[PDB]
Write a protein that binds this ligand. Structure first.
Ligand code: C2E
Ligand code: C2E
Lengths: 224, 225
């Protein structure tokens, strides 16, 4: 792991992303919860939304002065795991429930992935048994990828073997050879279902060729 | 190119802590323009911003709950984008720290910001201006210009100044690429460094084309081979 200044570290974290708060009371009792990162006020405070927890834990584990270990994630490229200690300084209910946490001078950062994931937005179809539904590739690596599907579309579970046919252009006809792999992770949202995939040998060869046709436009990878 | 986008997706494009431009039109018709840092958003309820660093007068006068304003935000990656929308100052807090809560409309306008993409990188180098030579680091590059940073205590430049950047072609700094020459177009000092935007002259464009051709994209940004 590496130690870097808090301004630079937090700059790697997208606002609204999820933070993992591990709180340790004065007696030693631990408590972990998740909550959205709002942002920072100057160099004085780290702002987060009040955790979606019980009103009992909320006032027995979430009190001013209590310390906690916070984990944040930087999604781009090889990604990064960010860890640091912070003290709960202030709690407000109005105009909206939120917490002000202290910002240490430095934070620890560690590599999250073996290789980088490249962002993109490529429409395609996902194959699974008799199903063939719409999907969009959101990121691609040499070993895997991320794709999303409609909330009402067929769902997959970790371990399922699927294949993605990515359109080579807007015609919605011709596609790159199948990207085959197993679902490794998933996360349902209100606007779509997300899946992480790890390619089998054939998938890796086809991904390699697809990456070879993509160009970086300063923001993400794009097709011709 | 102009399009309408839902606020959640549009604000996801804006980096937290970045400067917002607020154009306020009081209920009289009086207009005021100030800038202030974007903090973030709470759920899909409020847009949080730090209090503008303006005089108390203009403050209690142009910055009051209920007042409306047109906000301009920036999406900095690549060709970037200009995000424009209308918002109402809903709440003003003083404790524990001064901050304002603005309303978030359902949709926002997204329009073109740049004529071409800017590619991020981190290349150490030297900045030359008149008889001075100082350390700098190239932060982004495009066919027509670049962005570079310098130490807080180093020699400063003003818009219009013609400078030259000698970027090292290797980690050890055993040599430099042909110079990136052009005029300063914008600047901004921050806690850890001074930042400048530059627009190349002919020579600059030629050498920038040469430099870009030697860089690879590692998924996060361009780097030396
Ligand atoms: N391009 C792409 N590839 C994917 C995706 N999901 C899975 N893979 C591929 O599958 C491998 C194992 O993923 P995992 O089981 O989730 O196991 C993961 C996961 O537990 C953790 N990890 C990596 N990135 C993240 C992240 O952004 N968030 C979290 N919470 N964990 C991560 O590290 C482990 C190894 O990650 P990798 O070295 O990248 O190795 C990854 C990657 O090659 C995806 O969305 N996009
Ligand atoms: N690579 C790079 N090139 C730079 C930089 N600063 C200036 N240039 C070059 O100089 C041209 C004019 O910059 P400008 O006078 O600030 O005039 C700018 C500016 O007024 C506005 N603009 C562009 N990007 C941003 C931004 O990130 N923030 C803000 N506030 N305005 C921007 O649009 C105008 C035209 O922008 P461009 O089409 O890109 O054309 C830019 C670009 O080719 C830089 O930091 N990096």
């Amino acid at each position: 792991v590496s130690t870097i200044n808090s301004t630079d570290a937090l700059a790697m974290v997208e606002h609204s992303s999820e933070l993992t708060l591990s709180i340790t009371t004065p007696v030693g009792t631990k408590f972990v919860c998740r909550t959205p990162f709002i942002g920072t006020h100057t160099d004085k405070f780290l702002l987060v939304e009040m955790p979606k927890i019980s009103a009992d834990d909320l006032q027995y584990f979430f009190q001013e002065g209590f310390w906690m270990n916070i984990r944040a994630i930087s999604p781009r490229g090889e990604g990064a795991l960010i860890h640091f200690r912070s003290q709960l300084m202030h709690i407000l209910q109005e105009p909206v429930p939120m917490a002000f946490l202290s910002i240490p001078n430095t934070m620890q950062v560690s590599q999250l992935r073996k290789e980088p994931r490249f962002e993109l937005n490529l429409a395609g179809k996902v194959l699974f048994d008799e199903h063939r539904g719409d999907c969009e590739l959101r990121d691609l690596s040499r070993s895997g990828c991320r794709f999303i599907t409609p909330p009402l579309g067929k769902t997959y579970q970790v371990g399922d073997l699927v294949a993605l046919e990515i359109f080579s252009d807007l015609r919605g006809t011709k596609t790159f050879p199948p990207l085959t792999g197993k679902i490794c992770n998933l996360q349902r949202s209100l606007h779509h279902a997300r899946y992480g995939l790890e390619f089998n040998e054939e998938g890796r060869n086809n991904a390699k060729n697809l990456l070879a046709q993509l160009k970086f436009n300063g923001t993400k990878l794009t097709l011709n």
